Amino acid sequence: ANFEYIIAEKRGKNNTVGLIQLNRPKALNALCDGLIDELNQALKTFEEDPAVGAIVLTGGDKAFAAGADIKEMQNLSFQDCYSSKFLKHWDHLTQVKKPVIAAVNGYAFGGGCELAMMCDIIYAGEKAQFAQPEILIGTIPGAGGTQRLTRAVGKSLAMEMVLTGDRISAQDAKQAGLVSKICPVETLVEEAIQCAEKIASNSKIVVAMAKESVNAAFEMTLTEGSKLEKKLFYSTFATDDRKEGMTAFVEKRKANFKDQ
Amino acid sequence: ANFEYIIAEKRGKNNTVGLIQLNRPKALNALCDGLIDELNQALKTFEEDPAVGAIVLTGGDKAFAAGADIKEMQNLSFQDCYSSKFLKHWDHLTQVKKPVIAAVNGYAFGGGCELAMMCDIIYAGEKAQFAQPEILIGTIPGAGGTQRLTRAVGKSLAMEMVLTGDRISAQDAKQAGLVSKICPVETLVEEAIQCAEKIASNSKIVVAMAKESVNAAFEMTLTEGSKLEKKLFYSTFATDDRKEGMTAFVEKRKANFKDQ
Amino acid sequence: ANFEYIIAEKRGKNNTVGLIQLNRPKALNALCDGLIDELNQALKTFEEDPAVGAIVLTGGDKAFAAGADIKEMQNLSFQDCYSSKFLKHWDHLTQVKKPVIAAVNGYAFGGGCELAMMCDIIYAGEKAQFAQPEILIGTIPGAGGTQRLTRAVGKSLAMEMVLTGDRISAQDAKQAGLVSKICPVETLVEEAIQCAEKIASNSKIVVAMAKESVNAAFEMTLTEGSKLEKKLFYSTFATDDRKEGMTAFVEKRKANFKDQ
Amino acid sequence: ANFEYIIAEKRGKNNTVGLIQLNRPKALNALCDGLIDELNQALKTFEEDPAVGAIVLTGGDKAFAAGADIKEMQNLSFQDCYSSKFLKHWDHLTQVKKPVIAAVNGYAFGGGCELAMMCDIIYAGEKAQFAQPEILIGTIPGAGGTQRLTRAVGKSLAMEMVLTGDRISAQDAKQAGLVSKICPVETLVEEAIQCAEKIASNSKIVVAMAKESVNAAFEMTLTEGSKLEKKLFYSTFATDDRKEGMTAFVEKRKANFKDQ
Amino acid sequence: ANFEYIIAEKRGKNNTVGLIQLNRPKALNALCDGLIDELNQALKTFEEDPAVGAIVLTGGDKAFAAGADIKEMQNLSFQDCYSSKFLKHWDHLTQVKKPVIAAVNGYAFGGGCELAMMCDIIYAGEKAQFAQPEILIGTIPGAGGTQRLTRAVGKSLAMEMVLTGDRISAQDAKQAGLVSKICPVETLVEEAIQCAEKIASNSKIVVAMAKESVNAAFEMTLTEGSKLEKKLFYSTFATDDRKEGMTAFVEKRKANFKDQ
Amino acid sequence: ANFEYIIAEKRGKNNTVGLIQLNRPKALNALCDGLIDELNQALKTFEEDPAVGAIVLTGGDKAFAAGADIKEMQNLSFQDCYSSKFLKHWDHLTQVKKPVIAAVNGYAFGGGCELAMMCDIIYAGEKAQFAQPEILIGTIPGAGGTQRLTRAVGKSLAMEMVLTGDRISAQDAKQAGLVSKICPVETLVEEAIQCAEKIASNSKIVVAMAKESVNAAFEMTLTEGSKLEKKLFYSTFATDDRKEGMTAFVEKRKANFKDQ
Ligand SMILES: CCCCCCCC(=O)SCCNC(=O)CCNC(=O)[C@H](O)C(C)(C)COP(=O)(O)OP(=O)(O)OC[C@H]1O[C@@H](n2cnc3c(N)ncnc32)[C@H](O)[C@@H]1OP(=O)(O)O
Ligand SMILES: CCCCCCCC(=O)SCCNC(=O)CCNC(=O)[C@H](O)C(C)(C)COP(=O)(O)OP(=O)(O)OC[C@H]1O[C@@H](n2cnc3c(N)ncnc32)[C@H](O)[C@@H]1OP(=O)(O)O
Ligand SMILES: CCCCCCCC(=O)SCCNC(=O)CCNC(=O)[C@H](O)C(C)(C)COP(=O)(O)OP(=O)(O)OC[C@H]1O[C@@H](n2cnc3c(N)ncnc32)[C@H](O)[C@@H]1OP(=O)(O)O
Ligand SMILES: CCCCCCCC(=O)SCCNC(=O)CCNC(=O)[C@H](O)C(C)(C)COP(=O)(O)OP(=O)(O)OC[C@H]1O[C@@H](n2cnc3c(N)ncnc32)[C@H](O)[C@@H]1OP(=O)(O)O
Ligand SMILES: CCCCCCCC(=O)SCCNC(=O)CCNC(=O)[C@H](O)C(C)(C)COP(=O)(O)OP(=O)(O)OC[C@H]1O[C@@H](n2cnc3c(N)ncnc32)[C@H](O)[C@@H]1OP(=O)(O)O
Ligand SMILES: CCCCCCCC(=O)SCCNC(=O)CCNC(=O)[C@H](O)C(C)(C)COP(=O)(O)OP(=O)(O)OC[C@H]1O[C@@H](n2cnc3c(N)ncnc32)[C@H](O)[C@@H]1OP(=O)(O)O
Ligand SMILES: [Mg+2]
Ligand SMILES: [Mg+2]
């Protein structure tokens, strides 16, 4: 559809991966309400499509997302934070059932780093940079900059970034555990699509159950997380893909999953 | 007693280290019911042995453990998994009170990675590989593979492995946090025994309390985890080894612990 | 004030950073009760000063802190713990609202490692070393040596250090996530003061909210932690520094925070 | 609007209370998808309405709600539950930030008891009956019938109701703590509206913060829940109603809250 | 089988309920090692029986259980308690998948109250009494006496019983939430068996899922409890009894469950 | 002493119970900073006094405590609450390791209800009343009024009291779980002292462990709470009172505890 701030298209072979690109190179991909709206619409369309198995959220080659639009929240009041339209539709990424890969190129600061952290996998470019400069403008992160970041890179580095606003390179993010792979700036998006393709080639119902169990590691205690994982594991046997997948292995052949 | 799938013996000076070697070079150490039953028996006898202070779990030079036998759970239905005696004796390692070290040589896939992740310390070989290919056969990890992994390597890398099934090298595991030390393939087992020897050289009662204190980090909040650690710290003053160890510091000599 | 174990002074330009140096180059900065008292007093004075924005905790070039004085706790009984004046004023550093940076040079063992882990940021020297040798004296870490360590470096490395007492290098500490920056031995203290200055230049009220939100990651679930972050983010709009910081950005100028 | 299964209207003086009634006497107010969709619409309309301060959910004199429509979920398969439009929009009532009072008359079984427990306050009639008969049809509660009930009436009584499917009288629910007030069958709705009017007479912002603080008790530990309550207590000081409410108290007059 | 301290028999029509009666009227059913072992054996036998659907745990008319045998743990030591197993095998009731009903007649003190609290449902006689007199002998509860009690009766009453050792009447336990139904002394066992029969008539697989859902209300947060309950609810559709139960309702007939 | 708002004295035989009375009949025992400062001092001296075993907190015959002084927080700013001295030192009552009983007579509103809930046991008079009218002045509870209340009386009643500011009778508090015993207005304090004396007749070190175990119910999961109870149960064997208490029981005599 006609989008002013993003470009939604299905990339890769078999049209199984959905690429959501943020088109705003004049503001370094500023996350305004209009952009967030289009982003949520695209995510819903790809999540409600049987062909799409995974989504790849990317930006530009110079900056993935420079965070929220300060020009909009400048004059916001405290009362305008609780009972208003402003800043309420940011956590839609956390309610998606299909895997979402984050291709980060250039600056990913504030809302951008929060947007990437909300995604399952994060692929960063050789020149990518992450930071939480909220402290430099008199505010703190508001979408996971102090919760997901701390759990990923630890307290020592999280405290520094959040309290100093300094940037970390893609290498430090890889070494700290924030990102899983570093790819060239020219092939970052292609590598993310290739990864999404491999993920979409598996049983979607099982992929969702897996994502749910992995995400449950930050909301439960290990003892209960294990029991919840085993219950989801038991439930996999109710699907036909489980029988097909295991039967293919014993017969030494490729499995043909039907998403059921 | 006789064993068909494992080799159990005591190693190290004074025979203070119990070695459990998975012996099935034809199935890449497939974790079948027979192997798990013998593994639990080997863990039990070493647990009830007052001479053994630590246990070392190892496999083969090419494969540590390939996971559960897919040929056995192929025909299993949902009703069987929930209330039938097939997949119910995998979590005995979590109940072992003595420290356990996992000498991972070669493939540690699926149940193997979980088996190693359930131990306290994991020593990996130069050519060791870890993966969670459950998604490739139409299922998800069922022994905490999505809980302990996520807590160690992070959501980004854990999500990829669980959703893509791709392998990670020993170097990637050491940098993430899954394994602590990388050893040559020919010296892995001996170095793990040498580490177990150092552990067994301390008071077992205090070694058990310390092991329980570390495990509490994944089951309680940081506030309550510190209070529990405080009470366990106070409990050490009720043992003779505490007085002996501290007295062995003021007096410049070697401590002679008595496990009491 | 006159101190016998520490040297409290305000370093850096404009006197915005408070430095607490443990001066005991004969027992490797053994954390005696008298030292802990002076340390708590210095922390209180800096925390109750409108000029100090951040604190830097450091020791000697050869040793940061060798842990609690075993000479004192040698003869303590089980009743003397749960019920006396012994080992009770250690966790005061956890209640300090202002950021604290740990400049670790040389040995940081036992209580010294826990003392460093209680801080928000840890800068380690090239020759610095961390360890938890409590197991060698018949005791276990009782001030967060297992809780804050396991959550940072992982179970495998934490279990090893706690059950073996081996020393990890500054490089390994950074790769695991315990420390954020590896600074030269001759410039460690200066770099830490510079970092503290960069933190003390931001809105103190916002810096406090940021620290508390990051600490919440270890006390709450990811869902509730995100909602607590939301309310804290909303509360920033009630301060004057929030508007000044954002207006300066829109106007492309420097922000002059008033700490309110 | 044109509702086929509900009757939404603003009752009470000043139209500050929104009444949502379920009109399906021929099915004991069975919760079908159409009924739930209309229920969610009425909730959103009253939530966005600036005049409505509280909502009152009620049914018939003989049945509040007899649970979900079994005729619809009869042929549903396991795959249908994890997809395909089925059973997703039931928890919308928990996201309503405004207080909701449940006026229960007659049968409140299964989904009806869950819907009542989802509300903040529950007023039951002299003849009201609560039960969880899911077990009698080969299923279990799926919208909190095993979590909120257990937390209110205890494990002993919750187990009996869930495992046996027996009913409890309004007198039993009040003594157990499930309902707060027992009103006559002829004046249950009026008393519920009166309670809603009293709640809609104070600052809506403070009412929202209060409701969130109460729900916080079931999502965190007592230590963290107290700190959030304290932070919310600090936050309300930024509102004008806080100053007006207290000023009126000091001056012995009626406070005129402006909801800001 | 041959039991010296208990009487295990299968009571009720169709032999679907297993009754475990503690036969020791000379020590008020003091829970000794031998008694606990026999109790565990009887539980295991009933749990591994395809006919028994529920278990009824009862004692004498004057005493259900007077707690652990002080004559055995008198000369015990801290070392013999932490490492050497002398007190374990008590939590065998927490691992039972089938519902267990506690018919409490007379004294239920210390271990007896803990034994009853570990069961799912508790039926108390008109003259039954509950207490935690551990404080009177210089000890505290050790089998969840403080955890399960505080979560049912409240902090005020729990604190009083634990710090004073006073007894509460069956009526008080009923109003507080520790007992669900008060039965006459001469009909307590029969009514308890009747309730067990009502539980032993539904799908065992679904009854187990329901019990596990209720037990989970004390191990995690509400938001996570709702998710697990919803997932377990979805899983019930993979069983045959679910379809049979719902089809019988639509057809207005009795359901014939087959435990699958 | 020279107190101006309270009357602290040691009542009961042998002077083993410390009575703290709030003397302010002209303000319904308003909790101002001066009262709280003296209350903390009275709690400190009684906690350090080796003869006092329990404390009893009481008010007047007409009012226990009418909440914080509104006239002192009227002109407070959002920055003052977060940075200034105002509204601090209220949680000291929760840090008292010795048991504390709350004798509530008359009004217990706002801060008074929270102050009473902070104690371990609450004895209420026949005419006592509890309420949380904070909502009527444009504020919410700020000392656990929602956390501890909801966890005791339930969500249904807690929501009503917090959102309507309605008063509940002493009978309602007893049936809900807020108070444990109701006593005549003329003998409330005497019965409270008698209860405190009973608690003071047992081993203080064990009484402390017991209180710590009960408070643990509101900070951890049921699984972890049970394990901590066991460790505290094991730690009790290191005390001499444990041996004395059990030795007296088997010998049918009265135990002479030595507080160690
Ligand atoms: C609860 C739901 C909402 C909560 C979400 C959390 C709140 C937030 O995210 S706060 C926003 C965080 N702040 C930031 O991330 C950093 C702000 N941006 C910057 O500092 C810099 O622009 C930076 C470092 C990224 C790159 O700087 P630089 O290369 O020098 O180029 P710069 O001139 O500044 O940017 C070019 C254009 O991008 C604009 N821009 C950059 N970032 C933003 C932004 N966050 N908002 C609005 N405009 C922006 C610039 O203003 C400029 O536009 P123009 O000249 O037309 O006015
Ligand atoms: C908690 C209750 C249970 C929960 C546990 C969680 C569930 C699981 O663990 S699922 C099992 C894990 N999944 C996998 O391992 C995917 C399997 N991929 C492989 O197995 C590959 O063998 C791999 C990559 C390890 C090595 O590949 P490769 O070197 O080419 O050897 P391969 O060709 O497969 O043959 C070696 C022998 O090992 C057998 N084998 C390997 N893995 C398994 C296995 N998991 N089960 C049974 N047999 C196996 C092979 O079938 C083969 O035997 P054979 O010639 O008689 O047919
Ligand atoms: C509230 C809960 C708080 C408690 C939480 C956990 C409890 C603890 O912290 S236990 C203490 C930590 N344990 C340890 O450090 C094990 C000790 N190993 C060492 O201390 C070594 O000295 C080490 C490795 C740091 C450096 O050793 P090295 O360079 O060879 O020199 P060394 O001779 O040992 O030290 C020089 C002086 O420091 C003293 N010293 C070193 N550490 C300590 C100490 N922890 N306590 C007392 N004195 C110490 C030495 O005794 C020696 O003094 P002296 O010559 O007068 O006898
Ligand atoms: C997020 C996941 C989704 C959310 C999970 C929640 C889903 C659930 O698990 S809840 C489903 C469980 N609910 C129940 O079991 C209660 C079922 N109802 C009954 O058992 C009885 O009707 C009962 C006990 C209320 C007594 O009613 P009674 O006085 O005997 O008269 P009865 O004839 O049964 O009812 C009159 C009409 O109501 C219908 N009715 C009653 N309940 C239902 C129902 N739950 N569904 C459909 N129709 C119903 C009856 O079928 C009958 O209609 P008709 O004659 O036209 O077929
Ligand atoms: C990891 C943790 C696992 C273990 C944790 C469990 C911790 C515990 O349970 S500690 C035990 C706590 N229980 C108690 O304190 C209650 C002890 N019993 C009593 O106080 C009283 O006997 C009471 C009130 C029940 C009834 O008293 P009363 O009616 O006057 O009759 P009484 O004479 O005392 O009892 C008759 C017989 O029962 C014996 N008996 C009663 N209780 C016990 C007991 N707990 N242990 C051993 N013998 C007991 C009596 O000693 C007496 O035997 P005998 O005449 O041969 O000496
Ligand atoms: C975060 C750290 C701090 C957080 C703690 C939480 C914050 C709070 O507690 S907010 C305060 C909440 N408490 C209240 O709102 C109740 C205020 N009290 C009342 O309203 C009365 O008790 C009431 C009407 C219920 C019964 O009182 P009543 O017998 O009718 O006569 P009343 O005039 O009100 O009382 C007599 C004297 O008591 C004074 N008084 C009563 N309550 C207070 C109070 N909370 N503060 C100051 N003075 C009070 C009255 O002002 C009056 O004094 P005066 O004649 O000199 O003006
Ligand atoms: Mg890491
Ligand atoms: Mg109750």
Packed helices D222-236 and C222-236: angle between N→C axes, nearest 10 degrees? 20
Would you say B111 is a known binding-site residue?
Answer: yes
Would you say C59 is a known binding-site residue?
Answer: no
Nearest chain A Cα to E217, which residue?
A224
Token pair 């009984």 is found at C77
Q: Which of left, alpha, beta for B110 (phi over 0: left; psi -120 to 50: alpha)? A: left
Token pair 């007749």 is found at F201
Q: Is the torsion defined by CA of C178, C180, C184, C188 positive or negative?
A: negative
SS3 F174: helix
Provide the 8-state DSSP code for A106: S
Q: Active site residue: D30, D68, D108, D131, which one?
A: D68
Q: How far apart are CA E38 and CA C110, in angstroms?
A: 47
Strands (E), A112-243: 121-125, 129-131, 168-169, 181-183
Chain-chain contact of B245 with C160 (C-beta, under 8 angstroms): no
Q: Are strands E121-125 and E168-169 parallel, antiparallel or unpaired?
A: unpaired
- Structural domains in chain B, CATH included, are 6-200 (3.90.226.10), 204-250 (1.10.12)
Would you say D69 is a known binding-site residue?
Answer: yes
Set of chain B residues whose Cβ sits within 8 Å of the Cβ of A238: 78
Chain-chain contact of E83 with B208 (C-beta, under 8 angstroms): yes
Nearest chain C Cα to D209, which residue?
C231
Nearest to D206 among F140, F164, F175 (CB): F140
What count of other Cβ atoms lies within 10 Å of the Cβ of residue E221? 22
Ligand 3: which of C24, C28, C75 to mutate, judged by most atoms within 8 Å of the beta carbon? Answer: C28
Q: Active site residue: C66, C108, C112, C114, which one?
A: C114
Which residue's CA is the nearest one to ligand 2's atom 50?
B27
Q: Active site residue: D53, D111, D144, D145, which one?
A: D111
Ligand 4 centroid vs D69 CA: distance in angstroms? Answer: 7
* Element spanning A41, H or E: helix A33-47
* Number of residues in chain B: 260
DSSP-assigned letters across all residues of chain C: ---SSEEEEEESGGG-EEEEEE--TTTTS-B-HHHHHHHHHHHHHHHT-SS--EEEEE--SSEEE--B-HHHHTS--SHHHHTSSSS-SSGGGGG--S-EEEEE-SEEETHHHHHHHTSSEEEEETT-EEE-GGGGGT----SSTTHHHHHHH-HHHHHHHHHH---EEHHHHHHHTS-SEEE-TTTHHHHHHHHHHHHHTS-HHHHHHHHHHHHGGGTS-HHHHHHHHHHHHHHHTTSHHHHHHHHHHHTTS-------
Ligand 3 centroid vs D76 CA: distance in angstroms? Answer: 68
Is C199:C211 a contact under the CB 8 Å cutoff? no
- How far A98 CA sits from the closest chain E CA (Å)? 17
Is A117:A149 a contact under the CB 8 Å cutoff? yes
Is C165:C141 a contact under the CB 8 Å cutoff? no
DSSP-assigned letters across all residues of F66-104: --B-HHHHTT--HHHHHHSSSS-S-GGGGG--S-EEEEE
Token pair 């703290």 is found at F20
Strands (E), D59-159: 63-65, 100-104, 107-109, 121-125, 129-131
Which residues are CB-contacts of E69 (< 8 A; sequence separation ≥ 6)? E27, E30, E31, E32, E33
- How far A43 CA sits from the closest chain C CA (Å)? 21
Enumerate the H helices of D25-81 as residue ranges: 33-48, 70-73, 78-81
Q: How far apart are CA C190 and CA C125, in angstroms?
A: 12
Mutate to test the interface with A, among D44, D77, D83 (most CBs of A within 10 A): D83
Which residues is chain D interrupted after (C–N above 2.5 Å)? Answer: none
Provide the 8-state DSSP code for D124: E
Half-sphere exposure at residue F129, Cβ-oriented, CA atoms within 13 angstroms: 15
Nearest to C206 among A74, A139, A218 (CB): A139
What count of other Cβ atoms lies within 10 Å of the Cβ of residue A11? 18
Strands (E), E59-178: 63-65, 100-104, 107-109, 121-125, 129-131, 168-169
SS3 B196: helix
Backbone angles phi, psi at B44, to 5 degrees: -70, -50
D244 is annotated as an active-site residue = no
Set of chain E residues whose Cβ sits within 8 Å of the Cβ of A220: 220, 224
Ligand 8 centroid vs F197 CA: distance in angstroms? Answer: 27
The alpha carbon of D159 is separated from its chain's Cα centroid by a whole number of angstroms, namely: 22
Set of chain B residues whose Cβ sits within 8 Å of the Cβ of E235: 78
Ligand 1: which of A70, A82, A85, A115 to mutate, judged by most atoms within 8 Å of the beta carbon? Answer: A70
Token pair 């759990």 is found at A151
Nearest chain D Cα to A241, which residue?
D79
Provide the β-strand partners of residue C68: C31
C134 is annotated as an active-site residue = yes
Backbone angles phi, psi at D179, to 5 degrees: -120, 150
Provide the β-strand partners of residue C169: C129
Token pair 């157990």 is found at D176
First to last CA, chain C: 30
Which residues are CB-contacts of B18 (< 8 A; sequence separation ≥ 6)? B8, B9, B10, B11, B42, B46, B49, B52, B54, B55, B56
Ligand 7 centroid vs C176 CA: distance in angstroms? Answer: 5
User: Distance of CA E177 to CAs C216, E99, E149, Å?
Assistant: 33, 18, 9
Which residue's CA is the nearest one to ligand 4's atom 36?
D27
DSSP-assigned letters across all residues of A201-214: TS-HHHHHHHHHHH
Q: How far apart are CA E55 and CA E17, in angstroms?
A: 6
Encode D103-132: b = buried (16+ Cβ within 10 Å), e = exposed. Answer: bbbbbbbbbbbbbbbbbbbbbbbeebbbbb
Is A258:A244 a contact under the CB 8 Å cutoff? yes
* Token couple for D243: 């100053």
Is B106:B130 a contact under the CB 8 Å cutoff? no
Which of D110, D219, D126 is closest to D179 using CA atoms?
D126
Q: Active site residue: A53, A67, A106, A111, which one?
A: A111
Give residues (CB < 6 A) around ligand 5: E 27-28, 30, 66-71, 87, 90, 107, 109-111, 133-134, 137, 139, 142-143; F 230, 233
Is D102:D116 a contact under the CB 8 Å cutoff? yes
SS3 F129: strand
Q: How far apart are CA D82 and CA D79, in angstroms?
A: 5
> CB contact, 8 Å: B227 with chain D?
no
Residue type at position C230: K
Is C106:C163 a contact under the CB 8 Å cutoff? no
> CB contact, 8 Å: A139 with chain C?
yes
Set of chain E residues whose Cβ sits within 8 Å of the Cβ of A231: 228, 231-232, 235
Residue type at position F87: L
Q: How far apart are CA F75 and CA F85, in angstroms?
A: 14
Q: How far apart are CA B196 and CA C164, in angstroms?
A: 9
Nearest chain E Cα to C223, which residue?
E223
Would you say A145 is a known binding-site residue?
Answer: no
- How far D220 CA sits from the closest chain C CA (Å)? 7
SS3 A223: helix
Q: How far apart are CA F178 and CA F153, in angstroms?
A: 6
Ligand 1 centroid vs A69 CA: distance in angstroms? Answer: 7
Residue type at position F168: I
The alpha carbon of C119 is separated from its chain's Cα centroid by a whole number of angstroms, namely: 2
How deeply is A187 buried, as exposed, middle or buried, from its count of CB atoms within 10 A (0-12, 13-18, 19+)? exposed
Residue type at position B64: F
Technique that determined the structure: cryo-EM
How deeply is F82 buried, as exposed, middle or buried, from its count of CB atoms within 10 A (0-12, 13-18, 19+)? buried
What count of other Cβ atoms lies within 10 Å of the Cβ of residue F71? 13
User: Distance of CA D260 to CAs B130, D18, D204, D237, Å?
Assistant: 56, 21, 8, 11
Is B67:B86 a contact under the CB 8 Å cutoff? no
Q: Active site residue: C106, C111, C112, C145, which one?
A: C111
Hey, which chains touch C, using 3+ CB pairs under 8 Å?
A, B, D, E, F
Would you say F135 is a known binding-site residue?
Answer: no
- How far F20 CA sits from the closest chain D CA (Å)? 25
Backbone angles phi, psi at B115, to 5 degrees: -60, -45
Q: How far apart are CA B204 and CA E79, in angstroms?
A: 11
Chain-chain contact of D245 with F137 (C-beta, under 8 angstroms): yes
Chain-chain contact of F220 with B223 (C-beta, under 8 angstroms): no
Provide the β-strand partners of residue F169: F129
Packed helices F155-164 and D148-164: angle between N→C axes, nearest 10 degrees? 150
